[PDB]
Design a protein around this ligand. Structure first.
Ligand SMILES: [Zn+2]
Ligand SMILES: [Zn+2]
Lengths: 467, 876
């Protein structure tokens, strides 16, 4: 129902964390508890992150009102000759915040949230990766919003400087006027301000790139683990392998990368106008663009996976098995739910791209269509879903080597096109039903202890007789 | 040479391998705390840059021993100068730097001995005349992959530095590329002439091959260079040793005295005041030995609590309307100044602590004669008299233009509260009885500092203000003594033919037009840098001569006020110290400190006298100022009688601002007498002739330029004008009497009508004045001191509609307007052209309008509702 006193009674280790935060924090500790009821009653979240430089001002004025009044009532009682001064001491440090009210709301709102982390952590101990991912993406969105605001402000300041320089140029006044000295001095000041804004924007962009690379390198092992779990679950074992969290994460990452690249394009286009000497932007823009492109390519290269391997529809008991002259069902998904709204996306298929060097293997040709087209609205309605439920294979000891089916896609978005390839789990082709009785055991021989998935060359009781 | 091979090897490398080579045995300093210490605003116990440890390593090992006066070339942020300031034998540190984009600028700090260090920015060393010095430091130089350009830069640096050294000067100069022959041969002769050698600083990074040239050492160049090159090429063979972190130095805090004093006090006058002040705070009375005062006497100090901050209230209501003005740097950089004890000390050191020189005999005689004649001339129709208590009560009751005073917050809380009590009058009577016997006991001043921005000093029409507060009783006593000067309008244009006191702002343009109708040369409008601190004792003695027209108790009181207070002053000022905050008490004889109105009158008188003397000199009446002889004294007196009155009608002096139209252009070349009295001009060479104007619409006066306007029917008006940025930026500042919505709303509405009355003729200010008056809920009296304190009009504070006031001011009460046909709408009033508006600072005409035009219609009609639950009423 409240805070402060709850933290005090809890225990020392959380008090030390409380001690550190509130100490260096400008807001004095004493003022926190006297005004505790009022502070927690205010909607600081709306003031810090919203559109209306009026609510922040209102909260500013009310804060001053409360600070002034409470001092007077306590000043009437003597022997409180230390808190009264502290009330006036805080009244001086609030004064610089009058320039920008929103600085108050952000500082208070952040302070309220942090002690909530301590409280929940303390009770949980007394009585992970996904939450870290969500926190990371939330911070990313917030600081990207901050970067957007900074870019807009820089654009406006550069525009007004260009207008002032233009009106000075059309003036054509070569005089020894002290007004001219004043205006040249203020021109130098404007140039210094512009340089400072540019360097700050560059630093923020670099921080964003670092954080986003960290998120991607944390994300990829989850995809690898899901692939391993899918391999272990396709072998007649019930284990869920849902893709919703991974697809959402991939979509968020793709959106963030595209937004970052698009902003840098506009930044360079703006900088072109009044580009001049000692401009780090001329190199920073291209280096950041190259890094962003590299990260996008790296993410998209592993972003292609196959949800469902080619399976027998009539007999689902045996997966990863092929028979001549029959239809097969395959499902491939893109973890990134992004696509241009005017261009359909095209996916091709192939079988046995790389043949072995041994005696001529049983190469097979896809009689049916190897190409499928997805309508753009399908990505919105259900996602990037590819289904081939009628694929067939024909033939141009039986289980000594396996065959690999490959998927190839050209992904295009915002003018960037990348070639993408992926492979499915190795499979064996049988020309008759009877040989499957030993083909199952031979497939197990490959599956149980294969460290390389692309190598075409007691405990079992959970599989042999689990059915 | 081996250095070339080392450089080629380093150049042939990759970035990843490069980034690891840097730290392989160097010594680092742990700056993990200094960065965030400086970021939050701390100004002590910290090192600004990394060079402090670099120079410390040399000093502790007594390679170079600074002493006397130290000159730093290219100080950058200023680590070396700040470190040197805290040493023992150092007496003064001077630093020059070349600021601007891509370059470091100095920053202010308050470490030990911070008052002995002075730094400058935007000065190029390569074309600076040499000056006397005892120690020389140079740390300039930039690296480049090409060795030839590095050699050229090193040669240029050496040639620049060579001119400064003498036989007995300590030096420490950085040399960048010493391993190739064309620098070696040059350094041979230098080492032969001046001695010293080269040594390497261990703390330097491994990427560079720089060295340093020191004063107290010996050896051979080539052997040392070869040894260093061999070590460099052998270094990249072992493992990666973790750099040995070293703790950053701390500099403490406080001030440091130099040991010279040049002022002697008069104890028989101020002994009682000093004794009383000491007895009041006897508990913590102590003598400090580190007072930084040179030209002021020092007596003692005690303890107090710090008052002040950085930046003030910004008017909330005024904002949210001038949204497009946030990007403009002039508006924001001028917002508010610093009044903390550190800023007060900085201002006091910069401006108040100065010294002036006495004039010669001829100047003294001329000033005496002119002052006598002028005093006899002004009092031809008037007669001095004493003021009463009832007038003072009436003035204080109606919130008149009282001086800057403190109301003795202990016993009472406000002036109006304190007037009605009888004990206040008992204290006043006691002080009056003491004064009547030529003694004073409770007449001390309080100082407060202001004026401290970068771009704010160029647009606040002031800077270095340093205003003086006074007790209420002393203010009443001074009023009783010398209120007749202002209550009788002694300096009006009717009585004295030069003053403009009592004229509103909207009427000075006509006066300037009338001055231009005479025959002569051009108009000259020079100004003085820091007029208030250039007043000598002679000016005070000359102004004291008004008592010759008084008699009796009035004469005795006036003489006592002039003698015991105006030229024997005691002042309290704050000072930061390691133990907290202390208050010092100091004394001084000359310089001007008094009430505002008395100061205005006396400044006007002195300015008139000085201008008359300069006009005398230009005409060639007298020749030599060293000594004045007979047949010139009579000539001077005859000139004053014959044409004295008509010469005073060629000028217009408000305060310390003057505009003069002489008889001939010889006026611009006569600068001996003006420089002799100490009235040095501002931003000009000492003997450079002045500059005139051939048009009356360009001459500045009271920080204004006066355009002229033509109505639709044909009548012509003259209107004031300024730079719009200054007006908008000042309109955002609240004086600090708020802590409420009603106060700030009333203030905004109060000086949102100045714009509708005076500055109505420009597009961008007449639209922003209707919105603000449509946003406040009306029905509230707009009572608050706005601006232009000296202009005694304050007439836009009425309640009725502005059209009637405009008709009453600009038509019927305008002597220079012939026909009196009135107007009946706000559309007949014209605008300030189209391009002249952009010239003076508007935001219309091109893409800036593409940004602003969001303000109009789209934003105004929605922000007025954004005001919130606070009601209003439409006006547009
Ligand atoms: Zn007195
Ligand atoms: Zn103008």
């Amino acid at each position: 129902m409240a805070q402060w006193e709850m933290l005090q009674n809890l225990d020392s280790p959380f008090q030390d964390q409380l001690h550190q935060l509130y100490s260096h924090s400008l807001l004095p500790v004493d003022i926190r508890q006297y005004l505790a009821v009022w502070i927690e009653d205010q909607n600081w979240q709306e003031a810090a992150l919203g559109s209306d430089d009026s609510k922040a001002t209102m909260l500013f004025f009310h804060f001053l009102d409360q600070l002034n009044y409470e001092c007077g009532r306590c000043s009437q009682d003597p022997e409180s000759l230390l808190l009264q001064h502290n009330l006036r001491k805080f009244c001086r440090d609030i004064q610089p915040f009058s320039q920008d009210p929103t600085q108050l709301a952000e500082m208070i709102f952040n302070l309220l949230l942090e002690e909530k982390r301590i409280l929940i952590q303390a009770q949980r101990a007394q009585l992970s990766q996904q939450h870290e991912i969500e926190s990371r993406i939330l911070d990313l969105r917030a600081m990207m919003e901050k970067l957007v605001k900074s870019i807009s402000q820089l654009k406006d300041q550069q525009d007004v400087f260009c207008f002032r320089y233009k009106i000075q140029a059309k003036g054509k006044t070569p005089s020894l006027d002290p007004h001219q000295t004043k205006e040249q001095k203020i021109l130098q000041e404007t140039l210094n301000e512009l340089d400072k804004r540019r360097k700050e924007v560059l630093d923020a962009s670099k921080a964003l790139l670092g954080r986003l690379t960290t998120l991607i390198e944390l994300l990829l092992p989850k995809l690898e683990e899901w692939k391993a779990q899918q391999q272990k679950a396709c072998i007649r074992a019930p284990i869920d392998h849902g893709l919703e969290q991974l697809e959402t994460w991939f979509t968020a990452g793709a959106k963030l990368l595209f937004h970052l690249r698009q902003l840098l394009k506009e930044l360079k286009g703006l900088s072109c106008l009044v580009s001049y000497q000692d401009d780090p932007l001329t190199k920073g823009v291209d280096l950041r663009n190259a890094q962003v492109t590299e990260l996008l390519q790296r993410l998209l290269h592993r972003a292609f996976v196959v949800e469902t391997q080619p399976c027998m529809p009539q007999t689902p008991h045996r997966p990863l098995i092929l028979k001549t002259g029959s239809k097969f069902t395959v499902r491939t998904r893109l973890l990134v739910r992004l696509q241009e709204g005017n261009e359909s996306l095209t996916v091709e298929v192939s079988i046995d791209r790389n043949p072995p060097q041994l005696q001529g293997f049983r190469k097979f040709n896809i009689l049916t269509s190897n190409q499928k087209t997805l309508t753009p609205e399908k990505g919105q309605s259900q996602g990037l879903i590819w289904d081939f439920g009628y694929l067939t294979l024909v033939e141009q000891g039986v289980t000594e080597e396996l065959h690999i089916i490959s998927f190839t896609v050209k992904y295009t978005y915002q003018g960037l096109k990348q070639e993408l390839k992926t492979d499915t789990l190795p499979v064996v082709i049988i020309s008759n039903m009877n040989q499957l009785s030993i083909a199952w055991a031979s497939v197990l021989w490959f599956n149980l202890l294969s460290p390389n998935l692309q190598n075409q060359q007691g405990p079992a009781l959970s599989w042999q007789f689990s059915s | 040479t081996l250095g070339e091979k080392w450089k080629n090897r380093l150049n042939a490398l990759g970035k990843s391998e490069f980034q690891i080579y840097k730290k392989s045995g160097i010594q680092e300093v742990d700056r993990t705390l200094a960065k965030e210490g400086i970021k939050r605003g701390e100004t002590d116990h910290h090192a600004v840059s990394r060079g402090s440890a670099k120079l410390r390593w040399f000093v502790e090992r007594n390679l170079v021993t600074p002493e006397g006066k130290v000159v730093d070339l290219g100080c950058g942020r200023g680590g070396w100068s700040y470190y040197c300031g805290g040493l023992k034998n150092v007496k003064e540190v001077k630093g020059l730097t070349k600021g601007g984009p891509g370059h470091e600028e100095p920053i202010p700090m308050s470490t030990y001995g911070w008052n002995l260090v002075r730094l400058q920015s935007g000065v190029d060393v390569f074309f600076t005349p040499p000056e006397k010095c005892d120690t020389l430091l140079c740390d300039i130089g930039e690296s480049s992959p090409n060795p030839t350009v590095e050699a050229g830069r090193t040669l240029r640096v050496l040639n620049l530095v060579e001119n400064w050294l003498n036989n007995n000067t300590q030096f420490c100069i950085k040399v960048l590329n010493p391993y190739m022959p064309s620098v070696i041969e040059k350094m041979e002769a230098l080492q032969r002439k001046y001695g010293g050698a080269l040594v390497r600083n261990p703390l330097s990074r491994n990427s560079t091959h720089e060295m340093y040239w020191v004063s107290n050492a010996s050896g051979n160049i080539v052997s040392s260079v070869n040894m260093i090159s061999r070590m460099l090429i052998n270094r990249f063979t072992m493992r990666h040793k973790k750099a040995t972190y070293e703790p950053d130095v701390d500099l403490g805090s406080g001030t440091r005295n130099i040991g010279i004093e040049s002022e002697t006090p008069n104890l028989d006058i101020i002994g009682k005041r000093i004794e009383k002040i000491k007895q009041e705070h006897e508990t913590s009375w102590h003598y400090d030995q580190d007072h930084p005062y040179k030209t002021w006497a020092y007596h003692g100090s005690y303890e107090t609590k710090q008052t002040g901050s950085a930046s003030s209230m910004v008017n909330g209501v005024v904002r949210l309307l001038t949204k497009p003005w946030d990007i403009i740097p002039m508006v924001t950089q001028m917002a508010m100044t610093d009044t903390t004890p550190f800023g007060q000390q900085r201002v006091f050191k910069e401006k108040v602590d100065t010294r002036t020189q006495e004039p010669k005999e001829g100047t003294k005689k001329l000033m005496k004669i002119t002052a006598e004649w002028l005093w006899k001339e002004l009092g031809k129709k008037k007669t001095p008299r004493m003021c009463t208590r009832e007038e003072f009560t009436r003035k204080v009751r109606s919130n008149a233009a009282l001086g800057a005073i403190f109301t003795d917050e202990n016993k009472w809380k406000s002036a109006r509260e304190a007037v009605e009590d009888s004990g206040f009058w008992e204290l006043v009577d006691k002080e009056r009885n003491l004064h009547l016997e030529g003694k004073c006991e409770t007449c001390v001043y309080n100082m407060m500092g202001k004026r401290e921005k970068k771009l704010g000093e160029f647009g606040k029409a002031k800077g270095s203000r340093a205003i003086w507060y006074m007790w209420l009783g002393a203010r009443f006593l001074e009023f009783e003594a010398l209120g007749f000067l202002n209550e009788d309008h002694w300096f009006s244009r009717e009585n004295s033919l030069s003053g403009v006191e009592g004229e509103g702002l909207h009427k000075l343009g006509y006066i300037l037009r009338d001055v231009s109708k005479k025959e002569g040369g051009a108009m000259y409008a020079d100004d003085t840098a820091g007029w208030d601190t250039r007043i000598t004792l002679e000016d005070l003695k000359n102004e004291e001569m008004v008592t010759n027209h008084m008699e009796g108790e009035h004469k005795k009181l006036a003489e006592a006020i002039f003698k015991l207070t105006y030229q024997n002053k005691v002042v309290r000022v704050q000072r930061p110290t390691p133990r907290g905050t202390v208050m010092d008490i100091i004394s001084r004889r000359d310089q001007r400190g008094s009430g505002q109105v008395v100061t205005y009158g006396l400044n006007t008188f002195t300015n008139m006298e000085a201008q008359l003397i300069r006009q005398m000199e230009g005409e060639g009446v007298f020749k030599s100022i060293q000594h004045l002889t007979v047949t010139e004294e009579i000539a001077v007196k005859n000139w004053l009688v014959r044409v004295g009155r008509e010469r005073l009608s060629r000028m217009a002096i408000s305060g310390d601002d003057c505009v003069v139209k002489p008889l001939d252009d010889r006026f611009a070349s006569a600068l001996t007498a003006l420089n002799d009295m100490g009235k040095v001009r501002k931003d000009i060479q000492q003997w450079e002739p002045s500059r005139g104007w051939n048009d009356w619409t360009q001459v500045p006066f009271c920080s204004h330029h006066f355009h002229e306007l033509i109505m639709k029917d044909g009548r012509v008006l003259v209107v004031p004008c300024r730079n719009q940025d200054e007006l908008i930026g000042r309109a955002r500042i609240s004086q600090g009497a708020g802590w409420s919505l009603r106060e700030t709303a009333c203030l905004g509405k109060s000086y949102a009508q100045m714009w509708s009355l005076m500055y109505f003729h420009r597009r961008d200010l007449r639209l922003a004045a209707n919105a603000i008056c449509s946003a406040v809920p009306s029905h509230w009296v707009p009572t608050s001191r706005t601006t232009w304190s000296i202009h005694a009009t304050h007439e836009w504070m009425t309640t009725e509609d502005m059209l009637t006031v405009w008709n009453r001011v600009w038509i019927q009460e305008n002597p220079w307007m012939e026909d009196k046909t009135p107007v009946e709408s706000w559309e007949e009033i014209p605008y300030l052209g189209k391009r002249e508006d952009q010239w003076c600072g508007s935001l219309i005409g091109l893409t800036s309008r593409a940004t602003w035009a969001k303000n109009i219609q789209t934003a105004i009609n929605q922000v007025r509702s954004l005001i919130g639950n606070e009601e209003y009423t439409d006006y547009m």
